[PDB]
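User: what does the whole thing look like in 3D?
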Amino acid sequence: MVMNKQIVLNNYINGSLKQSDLALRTSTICMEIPDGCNGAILVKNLYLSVNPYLILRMGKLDPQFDSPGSTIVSYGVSKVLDSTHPSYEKGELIWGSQAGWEEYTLIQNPYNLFKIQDKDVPLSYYVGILGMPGMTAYAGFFEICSPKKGETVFVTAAAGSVGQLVGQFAKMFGCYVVGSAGSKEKVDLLKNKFGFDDAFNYKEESDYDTALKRHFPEGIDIYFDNVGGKMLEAVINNMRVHGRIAVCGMVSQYSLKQPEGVHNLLKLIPKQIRMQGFVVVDYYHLYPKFLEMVLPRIKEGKVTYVEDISEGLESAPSALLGVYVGRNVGNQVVAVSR
Amino acid sequence: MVMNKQIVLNNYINGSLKQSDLALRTSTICMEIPDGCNGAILVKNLYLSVNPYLILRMGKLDPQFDSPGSTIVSYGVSKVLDSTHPSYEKGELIWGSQAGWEEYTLIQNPYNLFKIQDKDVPLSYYVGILGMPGMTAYAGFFEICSPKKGETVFVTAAAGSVGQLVGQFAKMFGCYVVGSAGSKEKVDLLKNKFGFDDAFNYKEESDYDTALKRHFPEGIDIYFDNVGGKMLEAVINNMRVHGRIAVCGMVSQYSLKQPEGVHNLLKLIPKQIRMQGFVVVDYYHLYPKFLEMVLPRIKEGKVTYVEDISEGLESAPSALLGVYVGRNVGNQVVAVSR
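Assistant: Here's the predicted 3D structure for the full assembly of 676 residues, as structure tokens:
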């Protein structure tokens, strides 16, 4: 009864991303739920997330796998238009992992949806800090890395949707932190905006190992991995005993086949390194204690966050190549309406 | 006052082990402790352990590092001859990580020594099951891997000093287990002697990935890593979600420089793999609950174990190349006296 513009994929992304791999279509959708369909909500999407984890969802690996004609689904903000789930009614705002890259989405069995409880916060922050990215940074740091007071912490891609929060949580926790991003603009931004104890550009130093003792003569305890590759090789060579590595992303391998090899895995034994891959969805029962912790540190100016707004559905393809090659800054968020 | 024959190293072992790297010397030692030396024991060694972890101690890496003229020290059985530590007196037997590759060792500050409590068990088993190897297999399985009832378990080098126990503990725990060794004799031995649900030879199959779904069509949950290398690459490709990898050794890299690379580290995120390196010394406060668990399962024939005795101090160099190239079977133990 109303037209719905979807954004679909066109092939598994092994490497060399092309904008032709995203087919923008126009479909129909009824503005209310069909008969015999209880426990479902029809929503109008608003803001969608564009974080590196979606490129991993296109891997062509074994479960939860996204990838070509199927419609793209990820996190987003959506207004309930009609509902057969008594937890929701018209006009209510929510955010969850069931938002399609479309104007109107029919969610047939919502599970991890969280109520907006809107207050005065910008609505895009339930896609950034108050959504999956902030929940990812929180879960990856305190739950995985078991941080102790006054330990060395290091964050890759600290300009991304997750890293800019890992460093802020870690210094406010009470730890030495260093960040790494891929542009002069980001480095001093990461230095001036977030209070990072230090930062640098990883392609300025053509030798990762030399640059990591330049900032960590005492070794490193905690590593939040968003890049992987041979940067992960350099970290292991500098880890203190009983160090821990929370692996959230491996962006260096999204670009090309035959990913870079890691050869110093032997070091995991003599310095007893714990390395754990993780995804945010397994740590959603801790979102309450996450939010009430972030609640005060917002309006006192204690923490901050920034985005890269790209209004409209059509752009999303151009905004996805922005995070794929690293041209984006902060959090890539696309607006479909309002 | 009595001659003491030491065995020392000659160079860091990056690769290509040569027996010339072990210099057999003859030194002197007083048969009693010198004056002004409280809290020390002088011991006569008996049986020494020769497990793959000692080759790692020769790495040339950063702490606890063994390596060339310095005398080799590892686990062993020793009789207290004289003592200034009131916890020990003459004639008492113990075992710990402070046994030198010599006939008589002067231990100046014993810490992790454990009393023999001898009973009737063979004295070599406080170097095998009742010593570091059994404590390593126990700590690496139940503490690191958090095994649940009826999960898929896989053990590399299941003929080694540790793997032959990991599989026995795991099936008696209540789990499906598969082993991997490097000789026809070992495979059927591993099959007939230990009740392994299956086993194979890793160099019989010239493609590790193909052989691992041949035995695990359901995936793998737990991997006890004693080899590393590209066998670890194949395991990660077959791990179930939330799988865990306890890394005890990486023997494939002891042989050659430029160790084999692991490229599928990306898989750690979508299936949430926990990989942890570990050493036994950090889990010695659980040796009591280890021993009282093994206590019954010994003389009922429920568990077994085998060695590769090589009597005398002089051999130890020839016995060390046996585990370096894999020619040994079971547990390599050298006897220096009795």
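In plain terms: The longest helix of chain B spans residues 132-144. Chain B touches chain A at residues 56, 59, 61-65, 228, 232, 241, 247-250, 253, 258-279, 282 (CB under 8 Å).
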